[PDB]
């Protein structure tokens, strides 16, 4: 069900990603981590003491889709290194709430309001989410089957 998804999507803080390759999002799918520029860095370090969840929300460039989006589990550290494909700064850790697809085309009646109102899809790097758009956002996606929240709604 949807249930323990919109719990911890209540009053959560929403943040599009935008990756320039796929091989970034597999490996964040795999490891659990995230890295980000400076800039974006320090808004998700204040973020993450801000709000009871923040959601990280992934999209590749050109791909006409986001690949899932993940809840931040700590602010940024400086493990082994990973190798990205590229300045960065620390290590953000993620549990994923859902790696399935959502194309494009199913988020157009979206808009977010800190971003002009323009599509939810547009948007740099980093680009916050408005609460509305980005929880009518999230449900979207298809369900993961995979995933089990009970884990996440114990880390609140």
């Known amino acids: 069900g949807t249930s323990k998804l ?3 999507l209540q009053d959560a803080r929403f943040f599009l ?3 320039n390759n ?3 999002v597999s490996l964040a799918k ?3 981590v995230w890295s980000t520029l400076p800039v974006n860095e320090k808004k998700l370090n204040l973020a993450f ?3 009871r969840s923040v959601i990280l929300i992934f999209s590749v460039r050109e791909s006409g889709k986001f690949q899932g989006f993940a809840r931040l589990s700590s602010e ?3 493990g082994s290194p990973i190798h990205w494909v590229l300045m960065l700064g620390g290590v953000f850790k993620i549990d994923w709430i859902c790696r399935r697809e959502l194309p494009f085309t199913k988020s157009a009646h979206l808009t977010n309001p800190w971003n002009e109102h323009k599509p939810v899809k547009i ?4 680009q916050e989410i408005e609460l509305e758009c980005g929880t009518q ?5 298809p369900p993961d089957e995979s995933i089990d929240l009970y884990q996440v709604i114990h880390k609140m």
């Open 6 to 8: 919109k719990y911890v």
């Open 17 to 19: 990603i935008k990756s």
């Open 22 to 24: 796929h091989e970034n």
């Open 30 to 32: 795999a490891k659990g």
């Open 49 to 51: 003491r801000s709000a």
């Open 76 to 78: 940024s550290h400086h």
């Open 123 to 126: 948007g740099r790097d980093g």
């Open 137 to 141: 956002l999230c449900l979207l996606f």
